[PDB]
């Protein structure tokens, strides 16, 4: 159970974005139905009044929280991967538009899931803004909590993978457009019951075996991190 508070741009807090530049849902409950329209941008997908200005090459940091800013972020039980996707805003997230910019899943090197790292990072994870066309975009940050994912939601709706989805409105101002954005995948649609990484037993299946759901990270993506970029208590 987690939500996006706001974003940082090059280590500068853009302030509370909830219902402002984040298409915030009403609460922190997961999406679970893989065919749901709610897979696009969560349960209240609508235009919000502000879009955060960035330039290509900026570090854009999403900041998550549980109940209040800079709290426990997400329950530690919620082990799973983190991904970020981009789509042109005019799409409203519809059709074959979502391009993956970032994936972290299980990290053998230090025996962490992405979610574990997110908690350590005070809810903060980042992407480099890609060299796409100037204009308005949706950045879709997605946490998959796997603690109940040994069952399919379609078999038992009390369980299943849990999707914490947040769409931020981002305006890319300066960009040389050296990596034009291609068509992408649909949400809903890209994840199905058989997709790798949707049905997974963290209790009995080795985490080193986990494969995150496709699609693969786009060739144009410039990277990211899961790491604190600024101290929210420093304000
Ligand atoms: Cl839960
Ligand atoms: Cl950190
Ligand atoms: Cl099942
Ligand atoms: Cl990949
Ligand atoms: Cl490319
Ligand atoms: Cu939860």
Author numbering: 1 to 235
Sentences from the paper on this structure:
Lytic Polysaccharide Monooxygenases (LPMOs) are a recently discovered group of copper metalloenzymes that depolymerize recalcitrant polysaccharides like lignocellulose and chitin by oxidative cleavage of the glycosidic bonds. The His-brace is made up of the Cu metal center coordinated with the imidazole ring Nδ1 and backbone N atoms of the terminal His and the imidazole ring nitrogen Nε2 atom of a His located later in the protein sequence. In this study, the focus is on AA9 LPMOs, where a conserved His and Gln (His147 and Gln162 in LsAA9A) form the 2nd coordination sphere and a strong H-bonding network has been shown in the crystal structures. Our results reveal that the conserved His residue of the 2nd coordination sphere in AA9 LPMOs is generally singly protonated.
Three structures of AA9 from LsAA9A and Thermoascus aurantiacus (TaAA9A) were determined in this study. Three out of the six high resolution AA9A structures, two from Lentinus similis (two different data sets for the same enzyme) and one from Thermoascus aurantiacus, were determined in this study. The data for all the three structures extends to very high resolutions. His147 in LsAA9A and His164 in TaAA9A were investigated for the protonation states at Nδ1 and Nε2 atoms of the imidazole ring of the histidines. Here, the His residues (of the primary and secondary coordination spheres) undergo unrestrained refinement, while the residues in the rest of the structure undergo restrained refinement. Our results suggest that the His of the secondary co-ordination sphere is singly protonated at the Nε2 atom in most if not all structures. Computational studies on LsAA9A have also shown that the H2O2 co-substrate does not require proton transfer (and thus double protonation). A new experimental study further highlights that H2O2 is the co-substrate strictly required for LsAA9A glycosidic bond cleavage activity. Thus, at least for LsAA9A there is currently no evidence of His147 double protonation or proton transfer being necessary for the mechanism.
